[PDB]
Design a protein around this ligand. Structure first.
Ligand SMILES: *[C@@H]1O[C@H](CO)[C@@H](O)[C@H](O)[C@H]1NC(C)=O
Ligand SMILES: [Cl-]
Ligand SMILES: [Cl-]
Ligand SMILES: [Cl-]
Lengths: 106, 75, 105, 76
């Protein structure tokens, strides 16, 4: 079935990726992902740009003139990663835009 | 004030359960669209220049034409 | 099978009937984004860290997550001359009206 | 001197963008480009430590080489 634009689970396991040779912690985190239909009308929480408002309108009126807008992360949050840096030192650093906080149509 | 988002929320709430593959999609959709049209008309003056409003008005009108929803009818 | 690109999208306000309140412009080029976001994402698609990871995971196992999506990453305004609620002629920048760049998010 | 993964990726994308599986030598040309991409990324490993673009390139390359059955050793 074709769900509407929603935030869905996405588990990232750094150990499974072999990245524990440089990442110390965390070795896994919840990243989420966005997925689903962007249909007219965009609900307010999909927080469209003016462009997405117009494109969604045009795709509704003529799906051949433009494709629909796309369900993508509209707010993301960082996670703090403890890792071994290029100088072989322990570094704690915020990695921005790692966790989807909200999805929307763009 | 422009209250288009109230109209949209109502329309989305009312049609959120609709699944195009289920047997009564168009009749519930049209009633919903008619109410959405009425709601958007009631905030029209306050919303002039608001792209979300103008897009809603046109999108609704187009859908009601596409789906052959009568202008008047149950809501 | 095209890759993420900025494509033409012409908006005609007169065709939409908005020339009863928009004075100018009555048309503009909005563009749109469309196309595949495939591993590896070229730098100009400007992925977030999240998009980098998602594209990687979808490459390794398309069942684990869908690909990232081609969407506007930079937009620009257009100035619209129109009449507002009080019959005032207003000239206003409408933000985020024109796609300047597309990328994978 | 610094992290130069973007050059590696640009080269790989430039070299393979036209490739289409409907033509004969898709997989061989792709594997050649993949080996070159793997080599380019390997040579900037230290400078790129902690750059997710780099680490995902390394892993995605290794995974693609497995998926497309590209020998790790071979022409580029
Ligand atoms: C790689 O080898 C596997 C196992 O024989 C095969 O199923 C797959 O189709 C091959 N793919 C390519 C691109 O050669
Ligand atoms: Cl931590
Ligand atoms: Cl009615
Ligand atoms: Cl090979």
């Amino acid at each position: 079935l074709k769900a509407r634009c929603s935030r869905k689970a996405l588990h990232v396991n750094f150990k499974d990726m072999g990245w524990d040779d440089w990442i110390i912690a965390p070795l896994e985190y919840e990243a989420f992902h966005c997925e689903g239909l962007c249909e007219f009308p965009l609900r307010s929480h999909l927080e469209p740009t003016n462009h997405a408002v117009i494109q969604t309108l045009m795709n509704s009126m003529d799906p051949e003139s433009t494709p629909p807008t796309c369900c993508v992360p509209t707010r993301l949050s960082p996670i703090s990663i403890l890792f071994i840096d290029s100088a072989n030192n322990v570094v704690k650093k915020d990695y921005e835009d790692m966790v989807v906080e909200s999805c929307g149509c763009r | 004030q422009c209250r288009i988002q109230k109209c949209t929320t109502d329309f989305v709430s009312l049609t959120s359960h609709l699944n195009s593959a289920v047997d009564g999609f168009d009749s519930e959709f049209c009633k919903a669209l008619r109410a959405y049209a009425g709601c958007t008309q009631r905030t029209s003056k306050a919303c002039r220049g608001n792209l979300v409003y103008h897009s809603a008005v046109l999108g609704i009108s187009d859908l009601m034409s596409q789906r052959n929803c009568s202008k008047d009818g149950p809501t």
